[PDB]
Design a protein around this ligand. Structure first.
Ligand SMILES: [Zn+2]
Ligand SMILES: [Zn+2]
Lengths: 357, 48, 80, 62
């Protein structure tokens, strides 16, 4: 039971405050909770390396597929948008970063704002009319966003607002989870309020020596429907697992083809019966490399060398493994480590399904 | 072989001389200035 | 030109509580303003305007970046 | 922070071209009459002598 003791708490508006109550009620006629609210999820992991937990966190942050709202080329109608201040760049930057919880990539919206008044009129996100796709039985974004504002006698017409899929690493608009907590529960901590310890991190063991295996990770999701929170968060967690497994399985297709000359795997036979394996994979991050290094190191305690160098200006991860075995034995150990990673994340899948009811 | 393709050698069969080279040689032997040579070799202009 | 939709640092959905945070804040200032011209508010030398509880009631967490960007962001509508 | 609009904005440049009275004119040239057109140019984006507002002009475009 690797993953236990998860707790989920939404972020809700306190209507006991008179100022917030009056402002919301006179702006949006809002008297109860919004359709989509942020959710903070705190998770406890036991008997698992911090490499795996941090990789799961990274994937949930900016390596999981996610949906945003984007404007197709030519959507911003210059013929009708007479406003001089709401430029295409500003408005599309506003639209891209609205957190959405979409069901399909078919929905297409439109924003048609006309200002017949003598005062600046604020364009909110409730003015996004769905023009294509099946009719929504539940909103996919909050209606309280401020898309823009129009000067008197101006207009803003935007068509072909569609749902675009991508990973958060390439563009920040696909980021999913925001970090709220990360700690190790199996390492003692100093009281850092004292002036003797305020210059230190707090943990009683140095990171150069410690190997924690009992962690607490808390992440916040920006947009989750109220009546299905446990259905959404669970899905997210499960999604992350598959992604990692998928990426790991890619490396599992490299080691299987070590007999044929493969560009992403290079094998040398060094002196003193030593063998060397270099795995160069493009567009990989520290997640996969760190997981590979940690699990190879666990599998081979007396390994000669292992490193996962991810280079920023080369956009690639190079894993170097030097070990005193033959090529076949090294490949067998690598496959065993990959299988260990796969089974660990399968157990994470099972625990996620078991915990969140 | 006025335009659009190479001149071919009847003696062997491979390419012999591109037409713009012939026109350039004629202009060079015909006291042609650079501007009067740049404008005349405009029907041989490359990719538009 | 407005309060950002998401926090520039982490990306928390600040914008969905932005507009309300604007308007409500005004009345709070009107409660604490006190016999002073509006444009002289940042020079009163006697004000104690705290917006901690307002942002807390909005549901926004106690993150430094999020509250910083919510409070400090200028609005183009209010200067033009 | 960059993608979200941190320190992001729009940068402007202007092109002010003048005419010679009754000699020059604004209009799209034609290859078979006009002389010494710029090599590797792109004259097809002109509309009545000026590129229309809203199109993306890159290097080499007239
Ligand atoms: Zn010949
Ligand atoms: Zn923030």
């Amino acid at each position: 039971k690797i993953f236990q003791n998860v707790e989920i708490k939404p972020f809700l508006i306190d209507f006991s405050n008179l100022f917030i109550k009056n402002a919301a009620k006179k702006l949006f006629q809002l008297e109860e909770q919004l359709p989509l609210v942020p959710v903070n999820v705190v998770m406890d992991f036991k008997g698992i390396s911090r490499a795996a937990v941090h990789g799961l966190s990274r994937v949930l942050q900016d390596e999981i597929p996610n949906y945003m709202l984007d404007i197709k080329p030519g959507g911003y109608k210059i013929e009708d948008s007479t406003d001089l201040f709401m430029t295409e760049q500003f408005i599309r930057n506003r639209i891209n970063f609205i957190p959405i919880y979409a069901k399909n990539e078919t929905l297409v919206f439109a924003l048609r704002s006309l200002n017949n008044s003598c005062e600046v009129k604020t364009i909110y996100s409730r003015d996004l009319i769905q023009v294509a796709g099946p009719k929504l039985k539940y909103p996919i974004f909050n209606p309280t966003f401020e898309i823009g504002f129009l000067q008197p006698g101006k207009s803003l017409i935007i068509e072909d607002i569609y749902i675009k899929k991508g990973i958060g690493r390439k563009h920040a608009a696909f980021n999913l989870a925001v970090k709220t907590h990360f700690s190790h529960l199996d390492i003692e901590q100093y009281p850092t309020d004292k002036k003797e310890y305020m210059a230190l991190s707090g943990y009683k063991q140095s990171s150069m020596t410690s190997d924690p295996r009992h962690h607490r990770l808390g992440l916040c999701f920006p947009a989750v429907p109220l009546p299905h929170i446990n259905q959404a968060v669970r899905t997210y967690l499960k999604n992350a697992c598959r992604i990692i497994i998928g990426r790991i399985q890619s490396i599992q297709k490299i080691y299987e083809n070590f007999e044929e000359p493969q560009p992403e795997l290079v094998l040398f036979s060094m002196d003193e019966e030593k063998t060397k394996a270099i795995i160069t994979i493009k567009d990989e991050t520290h997640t996969i490399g760190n997981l590979l290094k940690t699990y190879i190191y666990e599998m081979i305690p007396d390994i000669s060398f292992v490193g996962y160098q991810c280079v920023p200006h080369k956009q690639e991860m190079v894993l170097t493994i030097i070990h005193k075995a033959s090529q076949e034995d090294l490949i067998t150990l690598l496959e065993k480590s990959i299988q260990n990673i796969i089974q660990t994340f399968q157990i994470l899948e099972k625990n996620v399904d078991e915990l969140i009811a | 072989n006025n335009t659009t393709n190479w001149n071919l050698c009847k003696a062997c069969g491979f390419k012999l001389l591109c037409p713009h080279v012939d026109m350039l040689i004629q202009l060079q032997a015909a006291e042609a200035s650079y501007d009067t040579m740049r404008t005349k070799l405009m029907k041989f202009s490359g990719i538009n | 030109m407005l309060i950002p939709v998401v926090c520039f640092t982490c990306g928390f959905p600040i914008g969905t509580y932005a507009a309300i945070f604007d308007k409500a804040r005004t009345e709070y200032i009107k409660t604490k303003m006190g016999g002073t011209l509006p444009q002289n508010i940042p020079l009163d030398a006697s004000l104690q305007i705290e917006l901690k509880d307002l942002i807390t009631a909005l549901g926004i967490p106690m993150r430094v970046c999020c509250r910083t960007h919510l409070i400090t962001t200028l609005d183009y509508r209010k200067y033009y | 922070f960059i993608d979200r609009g941190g320190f992001a904005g729009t940068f402007y440049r202007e092109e002010k071209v003048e005419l010679e009275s009754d000699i020059e004119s604004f209009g799209k040239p034609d290859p078979l009459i006009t002389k010494n057109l710029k090599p590797g140019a792109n004259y097809e984006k002109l509309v009545d002598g000026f590129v229309p507002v809203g199109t993306v002009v890159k290097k080499g475009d007239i």
